[PDB]
Structures are given as structure tokens and as C-alpha cells.
């Protein structure tokens, strides 16, 4: 789904996400936030699914910001072929989730509806969802 | 036992008094010879089963929420909070309050006026 | 048939109409044991030949239903 | 809570100590339409008709001109009939509410400060 319109390199290593939280692990603009539990790979398809689900349950006045992006691309070898003969080929773009980072923030919506929307979104993404209130 | 928004003249319209157990004419004669001055508006009436509904009848003058429009020279209000168009004069306010006094159990004219201004919000009108 | 009775029928015939119709003959028992008739003017009558009724045998009124006449 | 309880106790105790004519009864099953009708009967009087809690009434009677707690906090329904200074229109309301029920069983209070039982209060009412 989401994708930069120009990338210098085509076949980079995917990630080594093991460690602690990095980057956005707290709410910046939104009043409620989704925080994961373990680092994995997520495809832009699931991210878009979660976002559209939120927007569908989102009010016309509420606003949301995404704190992640499919920065890297997925690379798998084609089907039923032997091992070797160079690397694979690029595929759909993939975002990496670290340990306990925050990836979506929402604001301007009744708090119960906020929790409902976050719970709705959390079942699309492989990581384990957790809710956080605005911690200024 | 039921609640009826009966007419002011005859008592035929409304399938809530033709299936209670009282002859139509037997009560319509008294309703026409007693409520002759109160014909021309939907007037609620109260009935109850005592043996077969042969007695225990009372009138309730029309509520001041659709009359309120006509009382303040407004043709029709609205369903939501709408623009202020109508206004009832003070003398007409006392007249309406003392006409409703029969209907209400309110202990003073001010209580009735407060009730009317409480229901005077679905049409954007001022009762004073 | 299963679900029929005499007293209920002879009450409902007047509950719905009220023509004051009153039975003359008396059916024996109910649905399954109905094989004879007690007339108000004639004595007991019984039906012997099943499958094809051709003879009606008259018999005196017994004790228990005598008052029933 | 206890604070609101005590504040209302003090307020109602003062209100009842100021007044002299105050009688309560247990006549049972009072209804809101019956309450409205009997209030129409008591409309002339500033007398209030209601039922107040038992602890507050018991403390009001403790500060209440021949205290007695056996019936102001016990004995079921406690229907409050307080006519301040004049309890004549309140007496009319009492008569009306006696008519509203099968009979009158006087519980507590009196017509200005000398507690008498139902042997004469029924005659006083009618």
C-alpha cells in the first residue's frame, strides 16, 4: 500500500529488531495510543486494513496519526525453485515493529469509542495490542 | 382501560372507545350536550373500567404544545430546535394558563407557565 | 378422532350461537369407545357389525347411565 | 453519606422544632396520583406531604418536644403531615388521606405540642 516514490537501493537486509523500544514509543499528537508487545514484520496490507477499520469507526471529527511506515520491502524467492541462484525478488513493503513501540495515535473522540476503535484495530496486526492514555 | 384523544363534538373517531363496552350513543349524547363549548380541537379524555365503563369519565383540555402555536398565532412549529418566529402576549399567556388550570394539577399560574415554557422548546417560542 | 368431546361441543354450539339447541341422543364414552347410543325416547342401541353397519341391537338402559336419561 | 445525613438531620430537626403541629401516620400504599390528589386538597396550606427517613425523624423527635423513638424510626411507613402554626388545612388534608385509605392508625406527633393518641385525633380530623 504505502510506498516511497523513489528508493536508491532494491535489496537490503530486512531488520534486526531485537532489543528495546526505539523511535516513537509514546503519544505525540493523539490523546490515545496503540502500543505493541513484541517485534515482528507487518505488511502494508494489514496496516491499511487497521487504518480503514479505525476510520470507519472513527468519527468525522476525530483525527489519527500513524507512527510507523512500511520503510522496507519484502523479499521472498519464487515458488518451487531450488536454493541459490542469487537473492530473491522485491515484493510488498514491510514495516518492522519493535518491543513495546507506539504506532497509532488518535484524538478528538469519546474515550470509550477510542478504546473500542483501538481494540478493533488491534486484531488486524500480528503484534499484541495494548491501550495507552495521553501521557504528557 | 385505555387513553383516548377524542374529538370535541361526536365521539366516533378512534378505535379505543368502540371496543370497551359502552354504547356509542349512550355516552355521545352527554358528550355532545356537555362539551358543546369545547369542540374544534383534539381533546384528550380519560376513561377507566369500573364495571363496564358506564361512569367515571373526565376531560383533559388540549395540551399547550400544538395549541401553543395557535395560541401565539403560529401555524406550525418544528421537530428540532428551530428559529424563533412566534410569541404569545402576556394577556394571552394568562388566558392560556387559566384555561389549562382545569387540565393541570399545578398549584399556581406560574407553575403552568413554567411547564408551557418547558414544552415551548420544540418550536422556538417564548411563553411569558 | 383424537381431540373431540361431546360436552365441549354441546357447550360451544351455544357459546358461538346461543340457539338453545339441546341433544336428544347420548353418545357412549368418548372418541375411542363410541359404539352405541342412548336415545331420550328409545332405550339403549348398540352397533355389532363393524366395518359395515347393518343391524342396530336394542338393549335396556344400564344402571350407571340411567340417570343420564 | 454521613455528612449529608447529619446536615439534613440538623435542618429537618430545626424545621420541626420551630413548628408545633406535626403528625405522622402509617396508612400504607400511598400512590403518586393519590399524593397529587391529596396535595390538591392541601394546596391552601404550606404544609408538606412526604415520607422522610427514620434516623433523621428519630433525631428530630429527640430534639422534638416529648421525644419518643419507638415509632419515629420503627413501625413501617412514616407519612409526614407537618402543618406549621396552622394545621387546620393540614387537618383537612389528613381527613382526605384518611378517606384515601381503609382507616386511620395514628402513629406519632400532635396538633401543637401535647401528644394525644387516636382516641380523640380521629374526632379532631372529622
Amino acid at each position: 500500500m504505502l510506498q516511497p516514490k523513489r528508493t536508491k537501493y532494491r535489496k537490503p537486509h530486512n531488520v534486526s529488531y531485537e532489543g528495546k523500544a526505539k523511535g516513537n514509543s509514546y503519544v505525540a499528537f493523539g490523546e490515545y495510543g496503540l502500543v505493541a508487545t513484541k517485534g515482528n514484520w507487518i505488511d502494508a496490507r494489514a496496516i491499511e486494513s487497521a487504518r480503514i477499520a479505525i476510520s470507519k469507526c472513527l468519527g468525522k471529527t476525530g483525527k489519527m496519526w500513524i507512527r510507523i511506515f512500511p520503510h522496507m520491502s519484502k523479499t521472498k524467492k519464487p515458488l518451487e525453485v531450488r536454493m541459490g541462484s542469487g537473492k530473491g525478488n522485491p515484493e510488498f513493503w514491510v514495516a518492522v515493529v519493535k518491543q513495546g513501540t507506539v504506532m497509532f495515535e488518535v484524538a478528538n473522540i469519546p474515550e470509550s469509542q477510542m478504546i473500542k476503535a483501538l481494540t478493533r484495530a488491534g486484531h488486524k496486526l500480528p503484534v499484541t495490542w495494548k491501550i495507552l492514555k495521553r501521557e504528557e | 382501560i385505555a387513553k383516548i384523544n377524542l374529538l370535541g363534538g361526536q365521539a366516533k373517531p378512534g378505535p379505543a372507545l368502540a371496543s370497551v363496552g359502552i354504547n356509542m350513543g349512550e355516552f355521545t349524547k352527554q358528550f355532545n350536550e356537555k362539551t358543546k363549548d369545547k369542540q374544534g380541537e383534539m381533546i384528550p379524555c380519560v376513561i377507566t373500567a369500573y364495571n363496564d365503563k358506564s361512569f367515571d369519565f373526565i376531560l383533559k383540555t388540549t395540551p399547550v404544545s400544538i395549541l401553543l402555536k395557535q395560541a401565539a398565532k403560529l401555524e406550525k412549529g418544528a421537530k428540532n430546535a428551530k428559529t424563533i418566529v412566534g410569541k404569545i402576549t402576556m394577556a394571552k399567556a394568562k388566558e392560556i394558563a387559566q384555561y389549562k388550570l382545569v387540565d393541570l394539577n399545578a398549584n399556581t399560574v406560574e407553575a403552568a407557565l413554567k411547564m408551557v415554557l418547558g414544552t415551548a422548546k420544540q418550536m422556538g417560542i417564548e411563553v411569558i | 378422532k383424537t381431540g373431540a368431546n361431546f360436552e365441549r361441543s354441546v357447550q360451544s354450539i351455544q357459546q358461538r350461537l346461543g340457539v338453545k339447541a339441546v341433544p336428544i341422543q347420548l353418545p357412549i364414552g368418548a372418541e375411542n369407545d363410541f359404539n352405541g347410543i342412548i336415545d331420550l325416547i328409545e332405550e339403549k342401541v348398540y352397533f355389532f357389525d363393524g366395518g359395515k353397519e347393518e343391524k342396530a341391537e336394542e338393549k335396556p338402559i344400564p344402571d350407571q347411565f340411567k340417570d343420564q336419561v | 453519606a454521613k455528612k449529608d445525613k447529619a446536615q439534613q438531620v440538623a435542618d429537618v430537626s430545626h424545621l420541626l422544632s420551630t413548628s408545633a403541629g406535626f403528625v405522622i401516620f402509617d396508612y400504607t400504599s400511598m400512590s403518586a396520583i393519590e399524593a397529587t390528589s391529596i396535595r390538591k386538597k392541601l394546596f391552601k396550606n404550606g404544609s408538606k406531604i412526604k415520607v422522610i427517613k427514620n434516623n433523621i425523624l428519630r433525631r428530630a423527635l429527640k430534639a422534638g418536644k416529648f421525644e419518643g423513638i419507638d415509632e419515629t424510626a420503627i413501625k413501617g411507613k412514616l407519612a409526614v403531615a407537618v402543618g406549621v402554626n396552622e394545621i387546620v388545612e393540614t387537618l383537612k388534608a389528613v381527613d382526605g388521606v384518611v378517606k384515601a385509605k381503609e382507616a386511620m392508625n395514628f402513629v406519632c406527633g400532635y396538633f401543637d405540642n401535647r401528644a394525644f393518641n387516636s382516641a380523640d385525633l380521629e374526632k379532631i380530623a372529622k
Partner: protein, 176 residues
């Protein structure tokens, strides 16, 4: 809760004999025995014209057992001094009932005739053949007997036809 609730007793009409296996309660309405597991934690105190049972120890299992035994004694007393009655209505086209000896036979639309053995200790009253009155002192056994009677026929939602409890009323269902 109900463990602190009073347990009204009448020794002049009811004798309560404590056998650790079966408590024997005897009254003008008969005699009942309570089969109990060994070493019930609850302690029983009998006053003048009253009884009250508590738990010697404090435990979740003991907490449940306190209310359980309090309820058992309460229902036993109510049965032995007042009794229990259950009223049933058999609504149907031609569904009737009769009782012979200690066995209740039915008249249903079933091709196979329907009968039900009645155990001792309970009395069946059939004034109308559509009305059943089960009287006893054993509430649990009365309920069980009613359930065993109703397993052949229960009120259908598509048309009320079965054993109503004189209060069991549901919403009308009709595909037609």
C-alpha cells in the same frame, strides 16, 4: 448473607436428630433424612424455639457450604411444617390425565400410550384432567418428578401446548 439469616424452628412440632450420615427431621407432615458427607465443618446451635448454623473455620469451600446447609435446613423446615405444592396446566387439543393407584396415565396425541410411575411421599390431585397438583414435603423430588413427567411433552413455542407451570408464558411463534 443467608448463613447469618435466622432459621425459624418449632421443636414442639419438629424433632431434629443429629446422625452424621443422615440428619433426621420429623414433623406433622412426615419424616425426611439428609444424607451428608462425613465431617461437615459447620457447627449447629439450637436455642429455644430456634436454630442457627455457622462455620467453625473460614474457607471458600466452607463459605459455600454454610449457605448450602442453611438453605437445606430452611427448605427442610418449610417442607416439614408447611409443605410444598406445584400446580401444572396441560394445554392441548385433547390432552388429558388420570391417576390409578400411584401411577399417572396421560391422554396425548401420541400413538403410543403414555404412563408415568409416581413415587411415594407425594400426592397427586387431578380436579380437572388438564390440571395437576403435586403436593409433598420434598421440593427437590417434586421438581424432579415434574421434570420426568414433562420430558415426554413440553410447551411448544410454535403453539402453546404442554405443561405450563401456571406462570410459564413465552412469546408466540408462528411461521404461518
Amino acid at each position: 448473607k443467608i448463613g447469618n439469616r435466622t432459621i425459624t424452628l418449632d421443636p414442639a412440632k419438629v424433632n431434629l436428630n443429629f446422625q452424621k450420615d443422615h440428619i433426621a427431621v420429623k414433623g406433622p407432615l412426615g419424616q425426611i433424612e439428609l444424607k451428608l458427607p462425613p465431617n461437615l465443618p459447620l457447627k449447629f446451635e439450637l436455642k429455644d424455639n430456634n436454630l442457627q448454623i455457622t462455620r467453625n473455620n473460614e474457607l471458600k469451600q466452607s463459605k459455600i457450604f454454610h449457605g448450602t446447609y442453611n438453605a437445606l435446613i430452611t427448605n427442610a423446615i418449610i417442607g416439614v411444617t408447611q409443605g410444598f405444592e406445584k400446580k401444572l396446566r396441560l394445554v392441548g387439543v385433547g390432552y388429558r390425565a388420570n391417576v390409578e393407584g400411584e401411577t399417572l396415565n396421560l391422554q396425548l396425541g401420541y400413538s403410543h400410550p403414555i404412563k408415568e410411575k409416581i413415587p411415594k411421599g407425594l400426592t397427586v390431585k387431578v380436579e380437572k384432567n388438564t390440571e395437576i397438583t403435586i403436593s409433598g414435603i420434598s421440593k427437590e423430588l417434586v421438581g424432579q418428578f415434574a421434570t420426568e413427567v414433562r420430558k415426554w411433552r413440553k410447551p411448544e413455542p410454535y403453539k402453546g401446548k404442554g405443561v405450563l407451570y401456571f406462570d410459564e408464558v413465552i412469546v408466540r411463534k408462528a411461521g404461518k
